Symmetry: D2
Subunit: 359 residues, 4 copies
Amino acid sequence: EIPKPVAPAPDILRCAYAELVVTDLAKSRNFYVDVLGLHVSYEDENQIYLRSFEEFIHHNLVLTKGPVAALKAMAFRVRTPEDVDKAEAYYQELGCRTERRKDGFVKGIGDALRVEDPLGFPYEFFFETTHVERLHMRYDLYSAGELVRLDHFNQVTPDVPRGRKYLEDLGFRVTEDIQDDEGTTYAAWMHRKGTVHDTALTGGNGPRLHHVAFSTHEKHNIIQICDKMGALRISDRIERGPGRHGVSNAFYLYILDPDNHRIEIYTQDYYTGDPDNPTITWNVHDNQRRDWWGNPVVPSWYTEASKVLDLDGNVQEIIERTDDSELEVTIGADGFSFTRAGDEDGSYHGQASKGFKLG
Amino acid sequence: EIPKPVAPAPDILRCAYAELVVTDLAKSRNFYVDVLGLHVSYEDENQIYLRSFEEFIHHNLVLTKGPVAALKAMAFRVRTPEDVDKAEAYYQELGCRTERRKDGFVKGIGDALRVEDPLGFPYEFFFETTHVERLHMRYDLYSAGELVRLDHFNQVTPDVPRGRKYLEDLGFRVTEDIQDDEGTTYAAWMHRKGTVHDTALTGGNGPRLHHVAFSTHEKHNIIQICDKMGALRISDRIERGPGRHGVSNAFYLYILDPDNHRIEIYTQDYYTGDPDNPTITWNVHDNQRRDWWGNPVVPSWYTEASKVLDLDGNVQEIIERTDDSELEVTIGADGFSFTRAGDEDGSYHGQASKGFKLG
Amino acid sequence: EIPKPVAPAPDILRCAYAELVVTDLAKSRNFYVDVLGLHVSYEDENQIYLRSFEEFIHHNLVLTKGPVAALKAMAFRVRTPEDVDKAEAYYQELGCRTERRKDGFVKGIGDALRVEDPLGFPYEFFFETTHVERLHMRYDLYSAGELVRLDHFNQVTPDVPRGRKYLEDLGFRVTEDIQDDEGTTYAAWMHRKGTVHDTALTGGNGPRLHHVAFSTHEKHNIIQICDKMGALRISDRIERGPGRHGVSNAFYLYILDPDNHRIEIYTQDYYTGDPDNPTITWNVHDNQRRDWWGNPVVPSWYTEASKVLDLDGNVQEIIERTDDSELEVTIGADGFSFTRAGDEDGSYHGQASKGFKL
Amino acid sequence: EIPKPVAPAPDILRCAYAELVVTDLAKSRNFYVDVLGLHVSYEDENQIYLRSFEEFIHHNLVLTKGPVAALKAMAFRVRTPEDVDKAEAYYQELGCRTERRKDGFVKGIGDALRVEDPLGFPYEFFFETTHVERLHMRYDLYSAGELVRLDHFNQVTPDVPRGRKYLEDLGFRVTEDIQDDEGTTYAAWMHRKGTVHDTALTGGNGPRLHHVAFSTHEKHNIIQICDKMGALRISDRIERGPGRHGVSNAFYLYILDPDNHRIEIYTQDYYTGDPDNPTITWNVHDNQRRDWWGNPVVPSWYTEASKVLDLDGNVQEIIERTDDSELEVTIGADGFSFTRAGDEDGSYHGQASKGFKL
Ligand SMILES: [Ca+2]
Ligand SMILES: [Cl-]
Ligand SMILES: [Cl-]
Ligand SMILES: [Cl-]
Ligand SMILES: [Cl-]
Ligand SMILES: [Fe+2]
Ligand SMILES: [Fe+2]
Ligand SMILES: [Fe+2]
Ligand SMILES: [Fe+2]
């Protein structure tokens, strides 16, 4: 198990940015700028820095040219400069590796601490950042598919309760989760900023990064992203969706960048900011839980996910889930799901919903 | 082939209504009134008459209680009273069985002709109908999924070329179709009223009724129908969608009624009224032709459809398709589909798109 | 009163395009392309040919450099080539000026007739047109405010019943109108293609062209336009709206180009194509008739509209309306409108809705 | 001026509910249930308790029958039970009248303090409340105009900076305001929850309540409410809008209940949760500041607003504003506003925009 430090948690505001390593910077640029319409804060031969429509800090996304596509850092902003010190001491007491830089690891951040956390993810903590033009009323730039906010991260890790417990101590609150009747946990959603989440744990072989998620204003904006990809004839890059989530109640779409990093597009979850906000527990065999319309979850969503780096730039060793697999118990050959609890009509045995089995 | 008669064709305006036979009248009323929100023009213990938000003729849909779920009539409105006489002389010349009633076959229709057409579908032609209150500004009744118009029918029939020719002679115009490079035609779409269609031919064992289609104002209205069926826990009655059509460019959803009559919901196709409107031919192997975003067509959409009756009320017997099957050549075990013509990336051999095989 | 010719009427499909004379072509290009997002079929130093997102004929709008901002032609397409010959006989039998060109008056149009019609308007009729790439599934090119079709014209003319009869003989069919209890017709809406209209008549001093109208797919598209014009600090070129109409039931917005031609953006009216489509008459004092939410109609909407040209390029003389004016009787000093018939609460005497005088 | 107490401020989460006095309970029920489709958590002969689609606390709105229409209380929720003790001490130090009831003032709320604050408003602070079914996925019950959360209050007071300063000591952070260059502050917006506001200060005579505001999901939802009020022929109870704000960037509408309590509908403002959020100041004479599209602000918006009650159920005594009026210096006869600063095109002197005066 992971222990609670005596030293006090840093105060975390929100998820703020991610640094992804990409192999071909021109090819990733066409996708994140031309196709999806993020806005360039700064760029050179080695890096592109990008922000959503309504953001005032330097970037929400850094693309870094490198040899192996992988997550380099997930960054959280914290409330005061002094909370960075607090991060340092707190992870020092957990016995984790930490690396601090008073001018930052990337353009347009200042005093920053990166760490290998006890599940093996590169986490960054900062306050200082260069403010840029907030574009939020720049409706002369607005695209039909506009991405307005960075909303959350999603991490793959093989023991969900162990990760859950370490993130409650750091101050995150659980909003929803997926279990069975016999006490296995399959995923958990957890928050700092009063949306459904800032990061989430998906049971699975890790450490790996499942996705990063940007927000739209309205549901038609997500539809337009699917339409555009059809017109550019890259509909093979739409992995899953669009649809409505059970868990989180948000409208969604999952797409894939040229290195197969997964991006979610996401809108219209609910408010969680009150400390007794009711938690929601779904049964794993509930076919309405991940997609409310009962559409099947494509196998790659469970199996594929992005590698993560240590502080030296080497890939983290993968540790295998031993608990039950969500893929296996729902859509595999000995799996099942239901539409109405306890009813064999609109139940599925050994296959996915709507007439499909696994290819 | 089917001859062109000497007698002039009736002048058809549009699709107007369908009579469907249903087994349980209470359960059907629940689906169509309580779930879908259509408006009752009249009802009694045997029959319900339903119209959509913007319609002013008596009804767009008659439900009639009977022993076997089946289509009983698909109704086209003609331009003048005299075009009912022309429909009778026309189909008599083809040697088709006909029945004329001065007083209608259902309430709210006047002088009316039903026929067993040469493909064995029960067509009705009428001019006279009872006007009712047009509800088009009754925003006090508008639901979040309001169905606003009837749009079209879609018919299953073994020989599409044989079928389209007949329909062309009668004055329908082809707008789009689906073919391969060996000269097989799998489907054709055709209109009178200035949209992409008023009826369609889908290649398959027929005569069978594939679906009936209503439109909405906007795409979010269709999302609401899905969301609602989620909340009432009948997501197993969503067959296919929602998504964006290739053919027709409409936003779409397919659902099933308690007797497995399929209903499509549909919005935002394009204008076809000019007589030199350019026809679009899609290739059957093109994985964006039915769903533009490449999501797989569910098997039940190709195999299942509703029975139809002759005019003595017996089920029309089935004739098999001998021409190539669209299911078989796209997602069966020696099937093939592509995303980009000439590219092995984003192509599919012996399976469906996004990682699924046939259940 | 205008006679019905013995000769047969041309079969008109729909409105197709307008040619408008503009004064600075650069400044008009910035409006119709950069702000509004219409698609160039062709341009040179003197003309820009624009089309909407779903059009397959050559153009929905020609901008032509000229000394006087005006309407040059309003064009309707007919169903066959022989309907152009049909049109020529019909307007000759009215004693109207006609000019025919076998290769057209503008690019992308073939055999074509222009008339000074009996109301002094420039009507073009044609079949032949050059086909271009139908951009309807080009979502790589989709604007958040995309204009998807041409919907209709609106014409200002002094005597509306006189006009209406003429268009009925031509085979247009009236869908909605505005009258009062004293015999006056104020406006009228009429179709060939099976939407609420292709053209319409607004009582006023004319001939003038009141506006051209374009469709969007959804209501949010029309909002984006207003939000964009905000962002560019040209909100002052939003005349009226956005809103929902009484007449037509459509969501709407009116904006002004750089020569003050008026453009409407429109969506989600209803099907009119059955021949017993029920006509709706509104009373002129009904304050939900033009904006259903009862927002006031800005005076400039009643008073301003574009000059039109005769067939030699001269501005048509303007003839004054003698029947009562829709402005004077609703929101001028001696006007009246109501929210509910017979109810003093929510009625306005001598002023507009929501607290405003003119 | 209003002193910073030594006692610690209570930790305020958000606006939570308002209790409004109404004169006819059955007509107000018809407005708030049948027209707007809020969800009943409890009612009887004297009170109705109402919540929005995504709420899980007992109510966002109480309607209480009484002789005069007014605001009985605007309630904020605080993080812990201990915070209600802090609020009591804090306001006792300020010299303000306090009443603590351990069993609450209304149903579904437990331990609560109401206060007459220094600006004359009835504020409640509470943590304990009864939980009820969270209806967020009950799409079986979802209407085309669904109100999904309660968003904010807006208050009228005659000296904004004095009020600003009071709320800043309480933990509220200013996000946007309106000033001129003569020093004068006309209005200001502040928050706890990390949207643009939880309450706001509008310069004018008070104490009065300007409005309570509810959210929608999307912009078409707000449109539907206008369209529905047209079909019910109560478009005269649409005061102002729909529109897009400058300040806050939100899509908006303002409507009037049967007692002339004003309700905003509101969607799609921005995240403010970061402690260094850039503060935005608008010039008062800028005609895109309250309506981005430049539509005129109706005078009733500036001059009308609800009464408020003291803790005895009596009406506060109103206090005149001596500072410049926002109405007078924008849309009355010595006023002006611009579209583009330094430009006389699209300027209005002595009248409102789009061709009106008052
Ligand atoms: Ca072949
Ligand atoms: Cl999911
Ligand atoms: Cl299809
Ligand atoms: Cl109007
Ligand atoms: Cl405002
Ligand atoms: Fe996610
Ligand atoms: Fe269809
Ligand atoms: Fe118009
Ligand atoms: Fe407000």
